[PDB]
Design a binder for this molecule. Sequence first.
Ligand code: SF4
Length: 303
Amino acid sequence: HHHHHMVDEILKLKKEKGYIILAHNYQIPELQDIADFVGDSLQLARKAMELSEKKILFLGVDFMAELVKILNPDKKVIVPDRSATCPMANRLTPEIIREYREKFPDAPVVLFVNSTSECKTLADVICTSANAVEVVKKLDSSVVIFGPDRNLGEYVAEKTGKKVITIPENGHCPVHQFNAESIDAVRKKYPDAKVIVHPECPKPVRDKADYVGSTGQMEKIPERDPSRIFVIGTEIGMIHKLKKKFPDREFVPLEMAVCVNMKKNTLENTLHALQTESFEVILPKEVIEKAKKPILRMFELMG
Ligand code: SF4
């Protein structure tokens, strides 16, 4: 295979230099295939608490790389592209969080994992798409401040019956803005297919799906649902993941949806990262100390 040179050297350098490679489900297939662990944000966060390797190469976006670092302050965490980020986070700021705390006195602040580490220092609890409902359900409050994703917060409100105040204004993931007409059309094309969508999708898409869940939840659905065809409403990288796990099922994208930031990582720049052991993820010690609290609370509210 024509990529063999990069694949072979990545595997050699990872072993020689003592790295574990963690990747998100939206990474390109070629990178998923060289990673030691590929999962959703919650699975990556849990893996980050467990792993023993002294050095971590993380393949995803910066806020998750930083979460890995927060949980492993004394390990070296590197990423191949230091600009890979989630655009939804930048609109959420400390000033907005403090404004809303005052506006809603005793409402806990629940931040989605795609948020700056600075913002996480101000959060009561972190969540991911997988556990947001569970986290908010278990909190001792009928009102929560939630951000940055409005769709996820609205889904949480539905599922919990609680008041969810979303910050900032119109925070959303462009990748998951499918139109529900795509579900109508695929219902006609494949009448027995099951439609699985991400909770970051807008409400009419969520409401027309058979299942709503994180990418890790999506991967578990075929363990219990014997359907021959699944239609997948999330970023295109998950198709490869699902097809690998379940070669005897068919996975159809709801629409083509690409996260440009997730695609910044390539075989070439991942090789360069292992050659140079760059770019290290570095945070102020104060940020680690403060942000770890709501991250650890997330795990306390699950189990
Ligand atoms: S897919 Fe959406 S929410 Fe996830 S990193 Fe990309 S822009 Fe952010």
